[PDB]
Scaffold this active site. Structure first.
Site, PDB file in Angstrom:
ATOM      1  CD  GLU A  98      51.811  -2.679  81.045  1.00  0.00           C
ATOM      2  OE1 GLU A  98      50.872  -3.056  80.316  1.00  0.00           O
ATOM      3  OE2 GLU A  98      52.508  -3.463  81.734  1.00  0.00           O
ATOM      4  CG  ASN A 121      44.452  -9.871  79.474  1.00  0.00           C
ATOM      5  OD1 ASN A 121      45.416  -9.371  78.912  1.00  0.00           O
ATOM      6  ND2 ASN A 121      43.819  -9.274  80.485  1.00  0.00           N
ATOM      7  CG  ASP A 179      42.076 -14.249  81.742  1.00  0.00           C
ATOM      8  OD1 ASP A 179      43.055 -13.734  81.166  1.00  0.00           O
ATOM      9  OD2 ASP A 179      41.504 -13.719  82.713  1.00  0.00           O
ATOM     10  CB  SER A 237      40.435 -10.375  82.336  1.00  0.00           C
ATOM     11  OG  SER A 237      41.783 -10.639  81.982  1.00  0.00           O
ATOM     12  CG  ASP A 278      45.302  -5.850  80.610  1.00  0.00           C
ATOM     13  OD1 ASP A 278      44.678  -6.518  81.466  1.00  0.00           O
ATOM     14  OD2 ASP A 278      46.390  -6.230  80.126  1.00  0.00           O
ATOM     15  CG  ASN A 321      43.579  -8.265  84.201  1.00  0.00           C
ATOM     16  OD1 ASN A 321      42.453  -8.354  83.725  1.00  0.00           O
ATOM     17  ND2 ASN A 321      44.430  -9.283  84.207  1.00  0.00           N
ATOM     18  CG  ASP A 324      49.388  -6.942  95.095  1.00  0.00           C
ATOM     19  OD1 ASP A 324      50.633  -6.979  94.952  1.00  0.00           O
ATOM     20  OD2 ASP A 324      48.608  -7.490  94.291  1.00  0.00           O
TER      21      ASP A 324
END
Ligand SMILES: [Cl-]
Ligand code: NA
Length: 129
Positions: free
Chosen positions: A35, A46, A48, A50, A52, A59, A101
């Site tokens: 990562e 990203n 969209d 957003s 990281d 994110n 989650d």
């Protein structure tokens, strides 16, 4: 801070990640490697809009606030900048919430593509834990 492989494994172990939700330490180290290349200051944007953040590339779409991802959530209730610290505590606490989650470590695309179903134990081989 750019961690050494074993240094990070030890730091992660100390913060409760070994076998957290059934994920052995090697999984977390592998994920961090691909990562962020073990760099706490890693950021990536990203499509969209957003971003990281940090060692585990958490994110801004869901997990932290960076003040510029409109209509996003802040489920770890932290500024995204706290995820860039040389102290990995905030990244780890937030990661524990993500991996809990329902989707496990599949939330990390590089883990899914580069760690999952591999011999992850090789990532902590030789380390003094
Ligand atoms: Cl799972
Ligand atoms: Na956010």
């Amino acid at each position: 801070k750019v961690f050494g492989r074993c240094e990070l494994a030890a730091a992660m172990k100390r913060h409760g990640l070994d076998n957290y939700r059934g994920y052995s330490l090697g999984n977390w180290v592998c994920a961090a490697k691909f990562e962020s290349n073990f760099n706490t200051q890693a950021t990536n944007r990203n499509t969209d809009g957003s971003t990281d953040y940090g060692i585990l590339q958490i994110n801004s779409r869901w997990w932290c606030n960076d003040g510029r991802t409109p209509g996003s959530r802040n489920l770890c209730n932290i500024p995204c900048s706290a995820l860039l610290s040389s102290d990995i505590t905030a990244s780890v606490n937030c990661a524990k919430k993500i991996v809990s989650d329902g989707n496990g470590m599949n939330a990390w695309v590089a883990w899914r593509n580069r760690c999952k179903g591999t011999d992850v134990q090789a990532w902590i081989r030789g380390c003094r834990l």
